[PDB]
Every structure is written in structure tokens, then in C-alpha cells.
Design a protein around this ligand. Sequence first.
Ligand code: SF4
Ligand code: F3S
Length: 106
Amino acid sequence: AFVVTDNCIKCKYTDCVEVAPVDCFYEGPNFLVIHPDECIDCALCEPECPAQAIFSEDEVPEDMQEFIQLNAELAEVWPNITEKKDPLPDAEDWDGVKGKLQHLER
Ligand code: SF4
Ligand code: F3S
């Protein structure tokens, strides 16, 4: 499984979903997650993300380990996203800001 980490929050560029072969992505208000069971580990999404938020499970940063579990339980409750959409409004202002999980919206 691949995993969406902190930088996606409040950016949500949704470029990653345009390459997904299966329905691996689940949309939140200001964040996306990857269903670990859907994910075929194709790895196409990871280069697409402008926020560089996506990592292979095996490679999630130490400080971002909570996101492995977070994507797994949030994907059981959010709707599937299959189509790209515009980024959120302050997306470039929020790109690269750290600590954004404090801003996560369910
Ligand atoms: S690695 Fe492929 S299957 Fe997994 S989330 Fe990315 S696009 Fe989807
Ligand atoms: S910012 Fe988030 S919506 Fe996709 S393109 Fe990156 S993981």
C-alpha cells in the first residue's frame, strides 16, 4: 500500500487520482487517503503528487507513521474519488507547511 501523508492536507491537488488504475483513492474535505486493500502498489500516483505527499508504506517517514493507519481507517469512511478536480483555494500557500494534521477535516 501507498500512503498519503501530511502535505496533502489543505492542498488536495487531486492530480494523483488521474493516474490511479483502481479505485484506491478516497476523498476527504481537505485530504485524500489510499485504501490499503485497493491499492495495487502500481506506484503511478507517487510522482504525480505536487505536494510530494505520497509514499510507499515501506518508505513513510518516521514522523509520519500515524498516516499508515490513518489512510486505512479513513478510507473505510470517505467516498471514493476517481476524478481529478481543481486544487483547494490556498493550496500553494499551504504546500510545504508542516503540522497540517492539526487541520484535518473529517
Ligand atoms: S500506488 Fe497505484 S493503486 Fe496504489 S494508491 Fe497509488 S495509484 Fe492507486
Ligand atoms: S496533494 Fe493530495 S490529493 Fe493527491 S495530488 Fe497530492 S496526494
